[PDB]
Scaffold this active site. Structure first.
Site, PDB file in Angstrom:
ATOM      1  N   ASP A   1       6.543  36.701 -59.127  1.00 17.00           N
ATOM      2  CA  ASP A   1       6.021  35.506 -59.764  1.00 17.00           C
ATOM      3  C   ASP A   1       5.226  35.894 -61.026  1.00 17.00           C
ATOM      4  O   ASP A   1       4.001  35.931 -61.014  1.00 17.00           O
ATOM      5  CB  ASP A   1       5.139  34.733 -58.778  1.00 17.00           C
ATOM      6  CG  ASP A   1       4.841  33.303 -59.240  1.00 17.00           C
ATOM      7  OD1 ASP A   1       5.473  32.840 -60.251  1.00 17.00           O
ATOM      8  OD2 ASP A   1       4.012  32.654 -58.597  1.00 17.00           O
TER       9      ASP A   1
ATOM     10  N   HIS B   1       6.694  30.744 -61.656  1.00 19.73           N
ATOM     11  CA  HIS B   1       6.919  29.411 -61.051  1.00 19.73           C
ATOM     12  C   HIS B   1       6.369  28.276 -61.940  1.00 19.73           C
ATOM     13  O   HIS B   1       6.815  27.116 -61.869  1.00 19.73           O
ATOM     14  CB  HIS B   1       6.354  29.335 -59.627  1.00 19.73           C
ATOM     15  CG  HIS B   1       4.879  29.084 -59.568  1.00 19.73           C
ATOM     16  ND1 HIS B   1       3.950  30.086 -59.359  1.00 19.73           N
ATOM     17  CD2 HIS B   1       4.172  27.938 -59.703  1.00 19.73           C
ATOM     18  CE1 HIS B   1       2.736  29.557 -59.340  1.00 19.73           C
ATOM     19  NE2 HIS B   1       2.843  28.256 -59.557  1.00 19.73           N
TER      20      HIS B   1
ATOM     21  N   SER C   1      -2.685  27.863 -60.879  1.00 24.08           N
ATOM     22  CA  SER C   1      -1.628  28.891 -60.819  1.00 24.08           C
ATOM     23  C   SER C   1      -1.219  29.357 -62.208  1.00 24.08           C
ATOM     24  O   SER C   1      -1.202  28.572 -63.155  1.00 24.08           O
ATOM     25  CB  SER C   1      -0.380  28.462 -60.041  1.00 24.08           C
ATOM     26  OG  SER C   1       0.309  27.461 -60.704  1.00 24.08           O
ATOM     27  N   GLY C   2      -0.894  30.643 -62.302  1.00 30.98           N
ATOM     28  CA  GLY C   2      -0.542  31.267 -63.562  1.00 30.98           C
ATOM     29  C   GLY C   2      -1.780  31.843 -64.227  1.00 30.98           C
ATOM     30  O   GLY C   2      -1.655  32.692 -65.115  1.00 30.98           O
TER      31      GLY C   2
END
Ligand SMILES: CN(C)Cc1nccn1-c1ccc(N2CC[C@H](NS(=O)(=O)CCc3ccc(Cl)s3)C2=O)c(F)c1
Ligand SMILES: [Ca+2]
Ligand SMILES: [Mg+2]
Lengths: 234, 52
Positions: A88, A42, A185-186
């Site tokens: 994801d 994402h 995120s990530g």
């Protein structure tokens, strides 16, 4: 990261930061090897063009260990969808190899069965990043880390407004004000075993940050170990 | 608890049970020590170690 502590010198060396055209961080990543970064799929929609920074702990100063790397190939899982957030995960191949040094080193990729039976059964994992320090604030200029308990899968599903797929797991706290947050995120979720840190998750999503009765949702790296291995061989 | 379920079979890293005995192994960039249990970094900046 809401709560937790600053990463001190050498403590989070596998952290990577995806930076956009304005040299601003928008997502994290985990260094897997001299040429590869693990991140969330994402994250690939948050910037048109981006590079990867490693070895940074303070975005306001230059401690001499920082290095920016251009991305050569983006390998996005073909099943990712914004609709479910399932799958994801993505891997980045860099144009030039990363030079390991103080604050720059890879996290270990574990074996699947052993990681599920031994790592994911530990009490806690560690999440890290430069994300917001409160749900409504600005990104952290300092890299932070946070110990996050593994959450019972049934409790996780009961707490969530959206489907928790088999490619996801929960970690964090029911009410305690500690969690990953926007900008994290990530980034890495790693689990320590005898002083060695293994990749166990990718920061993926949460219904806000540190909300009561909500947990952080992580991509289950153990579900993608063959996919990651395949991605690193091409 | 037995084998890999008993203290990770005494392995530093990965533990597998083969023919009812413990078999240890290591992540890339480590070599299994002569005792067949410990993992020795093959070179500098092995994966998963803090740079302290
Ligand atoms: C409903 N679908 C359209 C999206 C969806 N399907 C399954 C789960 N989701 C999602 C639900 C919520 C969601 N949100 C809403 C806003 C939030 N953004 S954030 O940047 O604060 C991320 C915070 C995090 C907190 C803990 C973690 Cl591990 S990530 C976030 O991740 C999100 F990005 C996806
Ligand atoms: Ca810096
Ligand atoms: Mg909570």
């Amino acid at each position: 990261i809401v709560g937790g502590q600053e990463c001190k010198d050498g403590e989070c060396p596998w952290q990577a930061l995806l930076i956009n055209e304005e040299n601003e961080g928008f997502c994290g990543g985990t260094i897997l090897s001299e040429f590869y970064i693990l991140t969330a799929a994402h994250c690939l929609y948050q910037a048109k063009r981006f590079k990867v920074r490693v070895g940074d702990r303070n975005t306001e100063q230059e401690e001499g260990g920082e290095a920016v790397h251009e991305v050569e190939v983006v390998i996005k899982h073909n099943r990712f969808t914004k609709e479910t957030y399932d799958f994801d995960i993505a891997v980045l191949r860099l144009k030039t190899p990363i030079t390991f040094r103080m604050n720059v080193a890879p996290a270990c990729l574990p074996e699947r069965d052993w990681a599920e039976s031994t790592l994911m059964t530990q009490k806690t994992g560690i999440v890290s990043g430069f994300g917001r320090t409160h749900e409504k604030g600005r990104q952290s200029t300092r890299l932070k880390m946070l110990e996050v308990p593994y959450v019972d899968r049934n409790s996780c599903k009961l707490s969530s407004s959206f489907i928790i797929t088999q490619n996801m797991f929960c970690a964090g706290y029911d009410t305690k004000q500690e969690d990953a947050c926007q900008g994290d995120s990530g980034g890495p979720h790693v689990t320590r075993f005898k002083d060695t840190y293994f990749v166990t998750g990718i920061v993926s999503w949460g219904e806000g940050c540190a909300r009561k009765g909500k947990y952080g949702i992580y991509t289950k790296v153990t579900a993608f170990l063959k996919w990651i291995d395949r991605s690193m061989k091409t | 608890r037995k084998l890999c379920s008993l203290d990770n079979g005494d392995c530093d890293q990965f533990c597998h049970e083969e023919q009812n005995s413990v078999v240890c192994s290591c992540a890339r960039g480590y070599t299994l020590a002569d005792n067949g249990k410990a993992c020795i970094p093959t070179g500098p900046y092995p994966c998963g170690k803090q740079t302290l």
